[model samples]
Target: GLLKESMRIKMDMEGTVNGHYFKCEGEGDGNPFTGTQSMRIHVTEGAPLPFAFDILAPCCSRTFIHHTAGIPDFFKQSFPEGFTWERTTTYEDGGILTAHQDTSLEGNCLIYKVKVLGTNFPADGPVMKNKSEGWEPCTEVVYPDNGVLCGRNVMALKVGDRRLICHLYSSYKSKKAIRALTMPGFHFTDIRLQMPRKKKDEYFELYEASVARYSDLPEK
Candidate 1:
């Protein structure tokens, strides 16, 4: 089958809060800007990460932009020595287009882009206009007992003044509505969440926690 049967991924984030800033490396479908691209996120300071939240997005489209406009008083607030934060997204692939991203924390800049591949099924109808929303439809199985379909959602977050990025994937059958009891491709899933000076134990804990919380539900 030409579809993605399984995937492996890793993420890393490095930079200071107010001084030098940069976001480097790959995600689920690579960087989101080159090749058969599908999505992109770019943010620059003066315009920080917080300002980028809740912006209206279109479906099956490429490239999304977010900027930091307001400073929460919480930045002055601190957490336990290892206090943490997380961000997540539901997964649903619309087309063949891949997505990529790049960030310059010191410059207060972030950029994201995606390639729209159109639809695979004839009855799927036109792509939804709200890109922020997700879809989980019943798909027919092409493979007998070993069928697999994968979808991904990419997210970037700012906790107080710290920034983190994550990706979540969901697998479902080509013929059933998404549900709790349905078997998903958990083992084939990929995720990335990065922060500085953190132990691998801390990173894995936060990663698993976020995926556990949000991955199977349909988009709201």
Candidate 2:
């Protein structure tokens, strides 16, 4: 028997935040065939953060696996821990960034936990607003008739955990959009992240994530 719907993601982030340089390359996959899932993130050109973080997601009729893939302090909070701005340019701008990690095992599954705390970033706020830059504001996203319009100025993407949210610098944007994106259940979303206001290479990063619904999983 084959797993009905197994979800996976391969994401990349490379750019400078407030003059601090970093690059992250990672891949996470949940295979229904093996009833197992694993992930690894490597910071190739930045701090000496943890290079390998793996977990086992069990297979079942209701197995829901969620993974947030990207650099921290910009959007998602759960990434490799031990990141700091003490020696970077944002450090002078009242900026602070840190993370904590914890892992636990239950039955035949591994749970990986991580959280990040950051504030006062120099280049934080309304980073992208140009179509030429490959960013299509949620306002530009034409949802189907049944599609829910949470907000005009809030762009969101959800896979397992809430992943990327971009404030479109519009007064209409609100928590409503965040709530919709964070709703429980399996989801798949695709979005782009570009430089704060640059048109050149900008080392644009992309996040495409997806998760299979518990009921959709195979009962092996």
Candidate 3:
């Protein structure tokens, strides 16, 4: 429940992604970045809204970093505008996580619902490591009902019979993952915790990118 002070996430670029706003070939697309992972968000008109992150990461020592990563088939066309992203971990105490993020640039979607009834995670422990390649069982939970088990600051994935523990270094906090990203970059900030309106659960939790910045050029 405590966010360590040293664990501060820094991102360079920040904005929203929607079918109507930052759509494919629309505005704020094709922003370039000079980072280890050479990638960029190809915003399309019908794509589901995702948090775009242009990190202020200059430390650049990331061993395993993913792009637009989440539950398999998580990013699909089935998502309707003005809806919510809900997924629960297939663990004993793995609670429910509800996210309302399909919003525009003039808005902020809070991560309201959180229920962690599965595994009991400590305040500060070992960073979960992914031994096998690709996506492994991310948590201690067996065969997550929904294919992935991501709660709080931890994500347990699947790899046949093995499990991959997700962890963060360099200012690791229960809130954000620390990586080496520097200025003038962009990222899709995720759904903020819609707290107060609902009770926040610790066990359950929910949760990009590149670029060069030219003064006269369009924003990424």
Candidate 4:
């Protein structure tokens, strides 16, 4: 199914990290002009991680961003260490488009994994705008499930009655931190992040203010 380029998505997620249990619900306004995509997730139960507290300096209100571009040079020089990158290619056949990402904080116990699946749609067609709210219902099956749906971004996902519209970023392909191909869409599901043992072991140690300003994003 084709969706609007800049449409927003609301999501509800629940998962466990390092023996800790949690439930979360949040919404993303999609990508904004700051070359960033932002989302807010609240800890409805269980212990909150340092990353959540640092984002809002309070319990239960966590906001994070993926700053895709235009980072300040001064902050860029002092970016944190301990990161790696890998690439995977997926096809959009068999009525499903699934993307995966795995990230582990260096020397820390935090590991985040995300898997997104967009289903019940075909591979090709014009970016239709005739449908309301930017969601063109998935009706036609144009291509076989032979991996021909590579190199195309998923505009929206149809999971039951929810329409998860992806955030728009024209430069997504160039941002390494954005992990463009892995979980490419700004919309997400099944987000899992293990918590560090202590505050000192947090991923963004001593860079709280820096992250809120420019973001804790890695370089390309």
C-alpha RMSD of each candidate structure in angstroms: 19.6, 18.4, 19.7, 19.7
lDDT of 3 by residue, 41-72 (tens): 23233233221111101111111122232322
Candidates 2 and 4 compared: the better one by lDDT is 2
Q: Where is model 1 more than 4 Å wrong at Cα?
A: 1-97, 113-116, 119-220
- Local accuracy of candidate 4 as per-residue lDDT tens digits, 1-220: 1112232434343443323345544443332222233345555555444222221111111112322333222111112321221222221322322333333332212233333333333324111111212232211111112211112223343334545443211111112343222232222211112112223212211111112122236668
Error of 4 at 47 (Å): 3.8
Model 4 stretches with alpha carbons more than 4 Å out: 32-35, 50-220
TM-score of decoy 4: 0.25
- Show model 2 residue runs off by greater than 4 Å: 1-4, 31-38, 49-119, 122-220
Which candidate would rank higher by TM-score, 2 or 3?
2
Candidate 3 at residue 104, lDDT? 18
lDDT (Cα, 0-100) at 4 in candidate 4: 22
The CA lDDT of each predicted structure is 0.23, 0.28, 0.21, 0.27
Task: Score candidate 2 by lDDT.
Answer: 0.28
lDDT of 2 by residue, 1-220 (tens): 1123454534343444334455655444454333344444545565432111100010001122233332111112211111111111122224433333233223333243333333454343222111122233222121212222221234432313432343321011112334333222222222222223211322222322232223334679
